[PDB]
PDB file of C-alpha atoms and ligand atoms in Angstrom:
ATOM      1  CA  UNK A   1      -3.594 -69.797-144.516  1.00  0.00           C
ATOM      2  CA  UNK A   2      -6.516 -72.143-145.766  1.00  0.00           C
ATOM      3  CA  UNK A   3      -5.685 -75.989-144.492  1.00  0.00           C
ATOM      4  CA  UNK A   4      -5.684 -76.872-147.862  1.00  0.00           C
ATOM      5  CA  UNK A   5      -5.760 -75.007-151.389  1.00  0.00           C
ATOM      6  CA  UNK A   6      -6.036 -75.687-155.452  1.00  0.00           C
ATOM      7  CA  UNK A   7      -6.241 -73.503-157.713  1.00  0.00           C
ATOM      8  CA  UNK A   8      -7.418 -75.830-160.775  1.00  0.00           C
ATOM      9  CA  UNK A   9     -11.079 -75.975-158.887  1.00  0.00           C
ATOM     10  CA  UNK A  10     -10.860 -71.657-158.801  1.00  0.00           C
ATOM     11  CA  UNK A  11     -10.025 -71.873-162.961  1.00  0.00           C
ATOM     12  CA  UNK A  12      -6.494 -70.860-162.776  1.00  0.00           C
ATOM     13  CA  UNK A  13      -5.114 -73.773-164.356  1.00  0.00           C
ATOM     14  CA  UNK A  14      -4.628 -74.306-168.201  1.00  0.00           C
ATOM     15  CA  UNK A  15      -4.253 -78.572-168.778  1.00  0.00           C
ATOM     16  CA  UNK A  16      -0.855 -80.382-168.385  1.00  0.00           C
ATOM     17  CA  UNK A  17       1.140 -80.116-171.204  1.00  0.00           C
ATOM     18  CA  UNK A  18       3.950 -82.071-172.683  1.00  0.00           C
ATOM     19  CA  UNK A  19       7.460 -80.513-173.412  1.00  0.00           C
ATOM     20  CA  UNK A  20       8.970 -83.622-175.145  1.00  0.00           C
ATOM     21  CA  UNK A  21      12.652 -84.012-175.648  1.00  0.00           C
ATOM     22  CA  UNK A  22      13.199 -80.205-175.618  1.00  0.00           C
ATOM     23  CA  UNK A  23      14.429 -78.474-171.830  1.00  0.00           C
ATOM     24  CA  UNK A  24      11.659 -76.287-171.813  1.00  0.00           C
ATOM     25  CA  UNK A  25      10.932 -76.769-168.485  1.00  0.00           C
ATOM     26  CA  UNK A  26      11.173 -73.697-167.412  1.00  0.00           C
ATOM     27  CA  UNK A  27       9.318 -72.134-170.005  1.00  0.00           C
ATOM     28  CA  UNK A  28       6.027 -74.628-168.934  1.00  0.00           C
ATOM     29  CA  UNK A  29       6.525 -73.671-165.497  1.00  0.00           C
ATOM     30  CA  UNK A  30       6.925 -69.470-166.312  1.00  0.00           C
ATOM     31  CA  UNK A  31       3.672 -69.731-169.022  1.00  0.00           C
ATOM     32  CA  UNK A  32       1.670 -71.668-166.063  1.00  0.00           C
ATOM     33  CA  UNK A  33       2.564 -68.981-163.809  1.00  0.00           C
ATOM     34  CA  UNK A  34       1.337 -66.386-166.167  1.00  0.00           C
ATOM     35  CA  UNK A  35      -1.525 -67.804-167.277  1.00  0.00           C
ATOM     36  CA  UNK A  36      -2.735 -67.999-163.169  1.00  0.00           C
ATOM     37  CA  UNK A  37      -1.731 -64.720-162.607  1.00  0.00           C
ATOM     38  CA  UNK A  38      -3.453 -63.420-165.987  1.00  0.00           C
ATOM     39  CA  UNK A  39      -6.282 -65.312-165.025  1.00  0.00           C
ATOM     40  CA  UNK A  40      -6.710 -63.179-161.730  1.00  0.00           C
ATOM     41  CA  UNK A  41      -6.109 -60.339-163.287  1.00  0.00           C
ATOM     42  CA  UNK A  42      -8.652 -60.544-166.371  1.00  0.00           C
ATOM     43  CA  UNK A  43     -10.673 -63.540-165.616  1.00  0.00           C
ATOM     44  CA  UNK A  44      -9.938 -65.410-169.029  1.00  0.00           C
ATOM     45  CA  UNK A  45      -7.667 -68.295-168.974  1.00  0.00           C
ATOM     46  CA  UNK A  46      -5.617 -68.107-171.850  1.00  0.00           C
ATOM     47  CA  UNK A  47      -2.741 -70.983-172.761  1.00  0.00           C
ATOM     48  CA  UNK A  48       0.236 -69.307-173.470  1.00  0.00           C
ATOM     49  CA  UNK A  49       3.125 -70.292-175.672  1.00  0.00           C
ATOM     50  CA  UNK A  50       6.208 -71.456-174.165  1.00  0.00           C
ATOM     51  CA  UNK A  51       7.696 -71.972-177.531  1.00  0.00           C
ATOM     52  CA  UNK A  52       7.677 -67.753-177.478  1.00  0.00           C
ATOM     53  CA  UNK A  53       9.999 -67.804-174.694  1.00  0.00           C
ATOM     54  CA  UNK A  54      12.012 -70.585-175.930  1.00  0.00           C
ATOM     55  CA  UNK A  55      12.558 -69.040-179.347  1.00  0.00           C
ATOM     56  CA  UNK A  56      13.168 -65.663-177.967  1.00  0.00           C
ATOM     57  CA  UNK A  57      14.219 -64.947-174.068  1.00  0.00           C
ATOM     58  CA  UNK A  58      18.278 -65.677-174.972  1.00  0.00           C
ATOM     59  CA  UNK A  59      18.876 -62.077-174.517  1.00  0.00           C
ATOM     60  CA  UNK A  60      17.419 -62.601-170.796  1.00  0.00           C
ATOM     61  CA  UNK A  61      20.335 -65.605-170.182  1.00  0.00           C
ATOM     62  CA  UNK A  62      17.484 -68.250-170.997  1.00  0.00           C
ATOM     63  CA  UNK A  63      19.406 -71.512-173.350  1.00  0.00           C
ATOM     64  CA  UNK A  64      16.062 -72.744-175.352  1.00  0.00           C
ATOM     65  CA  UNK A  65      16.053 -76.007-175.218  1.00  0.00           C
ATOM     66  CA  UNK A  66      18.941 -76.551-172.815  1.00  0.00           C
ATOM     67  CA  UNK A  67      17.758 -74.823-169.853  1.00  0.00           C
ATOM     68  CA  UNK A  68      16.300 -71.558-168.447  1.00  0.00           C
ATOM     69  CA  UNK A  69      15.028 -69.984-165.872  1.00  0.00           C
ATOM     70  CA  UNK A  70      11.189 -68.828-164.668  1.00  0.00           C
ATOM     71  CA  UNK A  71      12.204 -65.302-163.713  1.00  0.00           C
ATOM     72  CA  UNK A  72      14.425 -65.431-166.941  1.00  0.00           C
ATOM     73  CA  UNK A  73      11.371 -65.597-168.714  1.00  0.00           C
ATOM     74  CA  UNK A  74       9.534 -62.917-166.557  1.00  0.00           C
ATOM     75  CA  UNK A  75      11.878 -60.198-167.380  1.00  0.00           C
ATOM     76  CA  UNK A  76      11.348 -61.833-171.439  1.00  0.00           C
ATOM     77  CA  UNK A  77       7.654 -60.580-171.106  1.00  0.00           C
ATOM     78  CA  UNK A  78       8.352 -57.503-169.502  1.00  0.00           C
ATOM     79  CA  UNK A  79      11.462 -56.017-171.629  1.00  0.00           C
ATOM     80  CA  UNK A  80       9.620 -57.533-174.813  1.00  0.00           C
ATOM     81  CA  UNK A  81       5.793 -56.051-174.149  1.00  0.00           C
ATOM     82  CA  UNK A  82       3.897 -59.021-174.609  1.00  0.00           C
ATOM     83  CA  UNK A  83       3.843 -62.686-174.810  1.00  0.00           C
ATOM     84  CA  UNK A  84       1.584 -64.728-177.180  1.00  0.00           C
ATOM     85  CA  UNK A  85      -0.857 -67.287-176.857  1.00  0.00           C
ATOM     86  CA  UNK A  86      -0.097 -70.993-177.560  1.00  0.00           C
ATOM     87  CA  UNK A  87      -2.869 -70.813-180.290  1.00  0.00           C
ATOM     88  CA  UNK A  88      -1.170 -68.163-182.137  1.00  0.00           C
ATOM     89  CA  UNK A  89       2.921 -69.567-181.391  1.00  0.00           C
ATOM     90  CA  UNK A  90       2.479 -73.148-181.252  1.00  0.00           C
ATOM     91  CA  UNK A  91       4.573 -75.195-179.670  1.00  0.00           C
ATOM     92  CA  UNK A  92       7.736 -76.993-181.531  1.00  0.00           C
ATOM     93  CA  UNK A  93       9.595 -78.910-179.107  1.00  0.00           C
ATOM     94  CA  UNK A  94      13.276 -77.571-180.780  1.00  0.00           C
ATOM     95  CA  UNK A  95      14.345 -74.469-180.113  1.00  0.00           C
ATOM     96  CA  UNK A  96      14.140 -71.629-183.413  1.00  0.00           C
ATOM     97  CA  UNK A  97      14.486 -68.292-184.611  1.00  0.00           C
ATOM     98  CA  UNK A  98      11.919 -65.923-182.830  1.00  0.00           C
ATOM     99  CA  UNK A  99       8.892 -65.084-184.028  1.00  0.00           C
ATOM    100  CA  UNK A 100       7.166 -63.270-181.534  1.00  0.00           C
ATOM    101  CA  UNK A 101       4.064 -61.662-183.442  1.00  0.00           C
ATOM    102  CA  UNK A 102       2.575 -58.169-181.350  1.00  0.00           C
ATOM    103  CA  UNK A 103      -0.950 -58.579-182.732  1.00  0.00           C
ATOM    104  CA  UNK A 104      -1.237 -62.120-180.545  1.00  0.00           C
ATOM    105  CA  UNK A 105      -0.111 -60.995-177.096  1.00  0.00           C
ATOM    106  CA  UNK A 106      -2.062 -61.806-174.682  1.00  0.00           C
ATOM    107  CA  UNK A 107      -0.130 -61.538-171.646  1.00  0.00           C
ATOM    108  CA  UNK A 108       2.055 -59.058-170.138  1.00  0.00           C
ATOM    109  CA  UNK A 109       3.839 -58.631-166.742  1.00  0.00           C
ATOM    110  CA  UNK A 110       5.575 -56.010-164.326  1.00  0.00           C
ATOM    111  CA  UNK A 111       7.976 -57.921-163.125  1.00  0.00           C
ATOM    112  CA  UNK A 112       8.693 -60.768-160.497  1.00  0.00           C
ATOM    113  CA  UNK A 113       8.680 -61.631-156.553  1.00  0.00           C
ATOM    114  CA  UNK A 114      11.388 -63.938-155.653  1.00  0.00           C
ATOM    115  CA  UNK A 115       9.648 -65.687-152.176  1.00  0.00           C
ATOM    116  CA  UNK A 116      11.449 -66.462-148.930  1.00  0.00           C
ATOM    117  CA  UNK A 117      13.445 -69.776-149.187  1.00  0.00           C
ATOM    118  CA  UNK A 118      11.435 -71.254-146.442  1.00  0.00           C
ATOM    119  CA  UNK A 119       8.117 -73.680-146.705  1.00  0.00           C
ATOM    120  CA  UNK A 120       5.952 -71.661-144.732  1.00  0.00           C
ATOM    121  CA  UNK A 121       6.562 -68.842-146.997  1.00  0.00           C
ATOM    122  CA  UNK A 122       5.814 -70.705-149.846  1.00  0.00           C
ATOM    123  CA  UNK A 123       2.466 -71.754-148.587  1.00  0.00           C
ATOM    124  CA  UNK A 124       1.373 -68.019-147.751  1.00  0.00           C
ATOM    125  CA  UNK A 125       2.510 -67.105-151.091  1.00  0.00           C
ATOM    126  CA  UNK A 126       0.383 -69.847-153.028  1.00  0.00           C
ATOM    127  CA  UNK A 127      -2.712 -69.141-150.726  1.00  0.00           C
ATOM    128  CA  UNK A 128      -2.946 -65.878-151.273  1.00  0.00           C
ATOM    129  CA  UNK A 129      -1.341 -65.299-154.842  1.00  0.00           C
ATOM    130  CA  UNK A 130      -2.306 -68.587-157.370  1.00  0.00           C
ATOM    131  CA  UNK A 131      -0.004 -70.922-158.577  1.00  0.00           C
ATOM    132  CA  UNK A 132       3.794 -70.388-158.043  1.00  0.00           C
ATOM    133  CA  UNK A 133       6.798 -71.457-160.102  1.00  0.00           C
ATOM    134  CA  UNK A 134       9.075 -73.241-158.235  1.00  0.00           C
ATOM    135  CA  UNK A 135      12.382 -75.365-158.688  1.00  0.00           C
ATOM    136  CA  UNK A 136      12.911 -78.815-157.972  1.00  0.00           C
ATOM    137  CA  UNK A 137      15.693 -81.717-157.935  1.00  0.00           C
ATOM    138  CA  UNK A 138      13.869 -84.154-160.229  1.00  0.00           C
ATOM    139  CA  UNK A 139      16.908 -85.974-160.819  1.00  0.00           C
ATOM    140  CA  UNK A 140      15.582 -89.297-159.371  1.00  0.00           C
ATOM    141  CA  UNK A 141      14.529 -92.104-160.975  1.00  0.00           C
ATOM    142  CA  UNK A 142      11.507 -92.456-158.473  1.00  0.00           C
ATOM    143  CA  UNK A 143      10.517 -89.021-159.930  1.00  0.00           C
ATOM    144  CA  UNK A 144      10.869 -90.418-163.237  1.00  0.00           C
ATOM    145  CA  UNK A 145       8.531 -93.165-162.612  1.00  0.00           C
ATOM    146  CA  UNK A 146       6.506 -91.545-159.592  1.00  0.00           C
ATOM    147  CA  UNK A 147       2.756 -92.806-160.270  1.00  0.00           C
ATOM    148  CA  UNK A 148       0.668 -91.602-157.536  1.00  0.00           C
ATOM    149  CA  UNK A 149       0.440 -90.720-153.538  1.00  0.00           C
ATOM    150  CA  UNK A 150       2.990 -88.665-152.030  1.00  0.00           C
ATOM    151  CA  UNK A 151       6.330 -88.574-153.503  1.00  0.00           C
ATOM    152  CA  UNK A 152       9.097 -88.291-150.920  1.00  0.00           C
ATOM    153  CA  UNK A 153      13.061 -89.491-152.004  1.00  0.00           C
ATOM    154  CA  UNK A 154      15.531 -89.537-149.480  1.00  0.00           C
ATOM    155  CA  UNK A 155      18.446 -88.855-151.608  1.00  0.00           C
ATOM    156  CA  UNK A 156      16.537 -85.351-152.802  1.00  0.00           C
ATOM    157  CA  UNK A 157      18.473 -82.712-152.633  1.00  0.00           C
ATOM    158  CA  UNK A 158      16.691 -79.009-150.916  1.00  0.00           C
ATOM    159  CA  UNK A 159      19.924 -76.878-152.964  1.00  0.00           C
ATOM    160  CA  UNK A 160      20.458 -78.657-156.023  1.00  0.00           C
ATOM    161  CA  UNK A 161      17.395 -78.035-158.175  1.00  0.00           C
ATOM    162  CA  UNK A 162      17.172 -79.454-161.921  1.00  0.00           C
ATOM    163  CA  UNK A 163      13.655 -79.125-162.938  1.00  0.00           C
ATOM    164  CA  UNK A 164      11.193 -76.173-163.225  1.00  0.00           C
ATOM    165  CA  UNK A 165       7.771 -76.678-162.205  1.00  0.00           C
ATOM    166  CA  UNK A 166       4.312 -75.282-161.080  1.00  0.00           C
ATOM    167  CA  UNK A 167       2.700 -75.290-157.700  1.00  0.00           C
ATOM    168  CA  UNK A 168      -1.052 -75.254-157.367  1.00  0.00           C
ATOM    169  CA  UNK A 169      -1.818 -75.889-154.524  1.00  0.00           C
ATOM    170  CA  UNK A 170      -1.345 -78.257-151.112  1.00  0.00           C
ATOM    171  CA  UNK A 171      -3.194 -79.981-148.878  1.00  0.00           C
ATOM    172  CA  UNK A 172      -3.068 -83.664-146.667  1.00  0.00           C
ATOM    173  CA  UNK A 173      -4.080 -86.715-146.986  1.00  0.00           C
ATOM    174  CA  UNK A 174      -6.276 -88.199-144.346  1.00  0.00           C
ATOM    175  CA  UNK A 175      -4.558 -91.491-143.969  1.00  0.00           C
ATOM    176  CA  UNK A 176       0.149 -91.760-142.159  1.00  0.00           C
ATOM    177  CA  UNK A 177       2.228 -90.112-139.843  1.00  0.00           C
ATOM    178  CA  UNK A 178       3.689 -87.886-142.648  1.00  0.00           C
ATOM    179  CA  UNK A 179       0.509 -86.821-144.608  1.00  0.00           C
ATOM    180  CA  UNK A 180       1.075 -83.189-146.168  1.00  0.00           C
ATOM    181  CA  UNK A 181       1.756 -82.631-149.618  1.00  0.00           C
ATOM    182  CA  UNK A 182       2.228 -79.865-152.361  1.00  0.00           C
ATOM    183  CA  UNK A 183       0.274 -79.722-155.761  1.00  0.00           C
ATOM    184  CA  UNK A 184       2.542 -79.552-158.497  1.00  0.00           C
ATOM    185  CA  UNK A 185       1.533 -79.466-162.038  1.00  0.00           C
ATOM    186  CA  UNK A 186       4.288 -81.159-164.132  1.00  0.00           C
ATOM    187  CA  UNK A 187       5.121 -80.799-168.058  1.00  0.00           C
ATOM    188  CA  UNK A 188       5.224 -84.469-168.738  1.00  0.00           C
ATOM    189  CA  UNK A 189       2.023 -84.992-170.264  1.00  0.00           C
ATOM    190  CA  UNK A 190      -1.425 -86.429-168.547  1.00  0.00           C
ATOM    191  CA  UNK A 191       0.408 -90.050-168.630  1.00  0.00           C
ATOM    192  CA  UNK A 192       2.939 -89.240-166.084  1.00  0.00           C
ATOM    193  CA  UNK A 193       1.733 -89.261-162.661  1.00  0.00           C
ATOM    194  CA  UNK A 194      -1.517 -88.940-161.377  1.00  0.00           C
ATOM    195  CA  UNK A 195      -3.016 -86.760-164.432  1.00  0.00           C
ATOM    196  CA  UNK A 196       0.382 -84.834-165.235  1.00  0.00           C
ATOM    197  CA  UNK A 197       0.753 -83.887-161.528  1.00  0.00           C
ATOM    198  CA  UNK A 198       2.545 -85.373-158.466  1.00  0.00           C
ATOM    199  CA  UNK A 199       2.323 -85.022-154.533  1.00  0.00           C
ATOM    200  CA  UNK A 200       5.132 -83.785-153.346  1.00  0.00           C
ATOM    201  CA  UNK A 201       6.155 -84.314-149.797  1.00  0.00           C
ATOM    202  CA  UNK A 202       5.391 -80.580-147.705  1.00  0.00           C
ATOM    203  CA  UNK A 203       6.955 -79.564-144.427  1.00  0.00           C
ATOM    204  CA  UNK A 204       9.809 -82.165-144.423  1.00  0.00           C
ATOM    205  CA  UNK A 205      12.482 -79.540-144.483  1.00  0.00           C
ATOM    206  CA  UNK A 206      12.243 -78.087-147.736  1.00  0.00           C
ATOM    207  CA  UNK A 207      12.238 -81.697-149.529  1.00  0.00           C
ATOM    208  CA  UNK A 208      13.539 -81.601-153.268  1.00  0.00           C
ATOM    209  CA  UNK A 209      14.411 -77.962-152.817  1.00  0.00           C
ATOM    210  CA  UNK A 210      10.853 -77.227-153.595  1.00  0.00           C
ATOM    211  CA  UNK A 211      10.937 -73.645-151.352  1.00  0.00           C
ATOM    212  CA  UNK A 212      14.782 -72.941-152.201  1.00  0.00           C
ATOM    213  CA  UNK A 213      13.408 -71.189-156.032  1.00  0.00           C
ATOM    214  CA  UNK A 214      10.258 -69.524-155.742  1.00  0.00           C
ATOM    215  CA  UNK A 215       8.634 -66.718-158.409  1.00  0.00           C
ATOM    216  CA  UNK A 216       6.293 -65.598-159.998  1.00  0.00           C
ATOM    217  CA  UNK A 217       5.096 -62.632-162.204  1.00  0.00           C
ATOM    218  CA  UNK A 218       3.234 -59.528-161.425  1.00  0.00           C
ATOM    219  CA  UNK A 219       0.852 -58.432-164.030  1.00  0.00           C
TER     220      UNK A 219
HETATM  221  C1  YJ2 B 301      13.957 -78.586-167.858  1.00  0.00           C
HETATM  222  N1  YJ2 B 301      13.449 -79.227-168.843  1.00  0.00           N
HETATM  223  C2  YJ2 B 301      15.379 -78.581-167.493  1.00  0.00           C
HETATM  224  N2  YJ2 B 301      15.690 -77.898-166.296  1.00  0.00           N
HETATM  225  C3  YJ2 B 301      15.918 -76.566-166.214  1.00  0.00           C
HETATM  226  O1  YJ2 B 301      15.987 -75.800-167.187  1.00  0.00           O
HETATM  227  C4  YJ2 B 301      16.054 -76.037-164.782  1.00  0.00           C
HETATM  228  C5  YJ2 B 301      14.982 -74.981-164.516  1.00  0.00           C
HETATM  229  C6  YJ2 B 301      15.642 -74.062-163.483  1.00  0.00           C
HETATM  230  S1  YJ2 B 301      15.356 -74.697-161.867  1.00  0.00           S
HETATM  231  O2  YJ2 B 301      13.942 -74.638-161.633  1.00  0.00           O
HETATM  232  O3  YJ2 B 301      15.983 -75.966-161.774  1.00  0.00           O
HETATM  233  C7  YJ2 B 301      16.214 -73.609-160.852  1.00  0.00           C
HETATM  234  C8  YJ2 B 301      17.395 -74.089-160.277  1.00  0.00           C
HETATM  235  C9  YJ2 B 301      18.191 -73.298-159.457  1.00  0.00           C
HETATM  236  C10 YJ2 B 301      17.818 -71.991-159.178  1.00  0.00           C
HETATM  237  C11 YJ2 B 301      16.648 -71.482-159.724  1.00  0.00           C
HETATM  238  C12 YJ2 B 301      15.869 -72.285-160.565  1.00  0.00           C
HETATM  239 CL1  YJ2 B 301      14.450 -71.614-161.192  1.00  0.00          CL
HETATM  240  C13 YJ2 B 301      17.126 -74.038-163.900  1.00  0.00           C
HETATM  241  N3  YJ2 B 301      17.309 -75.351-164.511  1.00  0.00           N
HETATM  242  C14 YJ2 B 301      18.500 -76.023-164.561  1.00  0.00           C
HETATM  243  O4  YJ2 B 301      18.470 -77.227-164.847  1.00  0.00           O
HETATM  244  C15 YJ2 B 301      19.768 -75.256-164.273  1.00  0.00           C
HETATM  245  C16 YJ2 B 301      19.911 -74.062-165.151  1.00  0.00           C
HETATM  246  C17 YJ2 B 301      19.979 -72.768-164.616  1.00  0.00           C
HETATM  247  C18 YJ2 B 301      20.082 -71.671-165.463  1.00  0.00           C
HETATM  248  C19 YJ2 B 301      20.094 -71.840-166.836  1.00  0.00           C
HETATM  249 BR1  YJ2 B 301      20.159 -70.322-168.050  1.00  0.00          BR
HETATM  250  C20 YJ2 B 301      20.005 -73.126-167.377  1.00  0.00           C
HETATM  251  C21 YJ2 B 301      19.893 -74.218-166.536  1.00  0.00           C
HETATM  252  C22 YJ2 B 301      20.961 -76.057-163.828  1.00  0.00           C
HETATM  253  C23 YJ2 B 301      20.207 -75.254-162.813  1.00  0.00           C
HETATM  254  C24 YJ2 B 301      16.450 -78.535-168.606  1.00  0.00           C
HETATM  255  C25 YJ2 B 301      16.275 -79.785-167.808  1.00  0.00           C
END
């Protein structure tokens, strides 16, 4: 695999995007998925809505604004034909009665890959694929108020994951001793972190659980 890889500089990447006080998540980090994977597919980058698969993907054991997961939300598209774009389903921030519209789909999929729970699987998979959901344990308070550099928390947990998020690349910084890092693309608006994203802390055994949930769709 490349030393280092981003998919925002290819186009893949729609901008961060702010979920408020819903748990939605999931739904940010199955739409960003998409919209890479749609992007290779068709060459148009097209924001798609999340509030779609919040308002709709129960049937698929997704809990709107309490919780869901990405591949959830893969089998949502797939069993429902279509998802639509953010234009045409905005997004609401409280979870409501589904109005998924035909005419506005612009986004399908085939299904998902689940990827082996290990790092070095997870890089092959974002070099050669685009960007990846993945799971995280977020439940820090240095994640909360995580600014820039590489984020590393000793009390992370690799099994117990709380937090759905998007993988766009990784890379290293030439600075110390511990210098590689993931790209993740959070759901916390541009103010959090460095733009919306964060550095996360790659090949130090499977820190925050980052390689333990892995998807994405196939279109
Ligand atoms: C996002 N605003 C919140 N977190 C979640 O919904 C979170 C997303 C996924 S996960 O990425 O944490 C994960 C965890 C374990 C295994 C696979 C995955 Cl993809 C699930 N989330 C959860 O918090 C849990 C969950 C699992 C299933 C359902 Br349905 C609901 C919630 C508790 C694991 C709401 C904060």
């Amino acid at each position: 695999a490349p030393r280092s890889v981003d998919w925002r500089e290819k186009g893949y990447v729609t901008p961060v995007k702010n979920q408020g006080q819903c748990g939605s998540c999931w739904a940010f980090s199955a739409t960003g998925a998409l919209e890479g994977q749609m992007f290779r597919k068709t060459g148009r980058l097209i924001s798609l809505s999340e509030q779609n698969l919040v308002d709709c993907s129960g049937p698929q054991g997704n809990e709107g604004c309490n919780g869901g997961l990405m591949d959830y939300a893969f089998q949502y598209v797939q069993d429902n034909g279509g998802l639509d774009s953010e234009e045409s389903y905005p997004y609401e921030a409280t979870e409501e009665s589904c109005k998924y519209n035909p005419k506005y789909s612009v986004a399908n999929d085939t299904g998902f890959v689940d990827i082996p729970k290990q790092e070095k699987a997870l890089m092959k998979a974002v070099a050669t694929v685009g960007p990846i959901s993945v799971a995280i344990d977020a439940g820090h308070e240095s994640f909360l108020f995580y600014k820039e550099g590489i984020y590393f928390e000793p009390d992370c947990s690799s099994e117990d994951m709380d937090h759905g998020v998007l993988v766009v690349g990784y890379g290293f910084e030439s600075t110390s001793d511990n210098n590689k890092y993931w790209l993740v693309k959070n759901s916390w608006g541009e103010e959090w972190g460095m733009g919306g994203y964060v550095k996360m802390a790659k090949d130090r055994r499977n820190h925050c659980g980052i390689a333990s949930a892995a998807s994405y769709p196939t279109v």
